[PDB]
């Protein structure tokens, strides 16, 4: 079976390339503006880094 005519077709492909960049202030999230909580949290600085 041999084709006798043709068709020219255009199709689309969608690909993700990047995502949102985020940063966290560890003390702001855990303690807010409490000085006492920050003095207590000074024992966990390595984990936030």
């Amino acid at each position: 079976a041999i084709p006798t005519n043709f068709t020219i077709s255009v199709t689309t492909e969608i690909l993700p390339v990047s995502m949102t960049k985020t940063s966290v202030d560890c003390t702001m999230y855990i303690c807010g503006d409490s000085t006492e909580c920050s003095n207590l949290l000074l024992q966990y600085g390595s984990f936030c880094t």
Binding site: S23, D25, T27, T49
Partner: protein, 50 residues
């Protein structure tokens, strides 16, 4: 005469046990990045501080 305040300092001990240098971690953003990296030397770049 000067007056003391509660501060966080990064002190340096040499191989004989004497304090030879210090960083005041809340003077400048540069000092804050020094304090975070735990080094007295900072390489070229952009750093998030606080």
């Amino acid at each position: 005469v000067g007056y003391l305040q509660p501060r966080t300092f990064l002190l340096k001990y040499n191989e004989n046990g004497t304090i030879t240098d210090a960083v005041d971690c809340a003077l400048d953003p540069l000092s804050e990045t020094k304090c975070t990296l735990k080094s007295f030397t900072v390489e070229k770049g952009i750093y998030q501080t606080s």
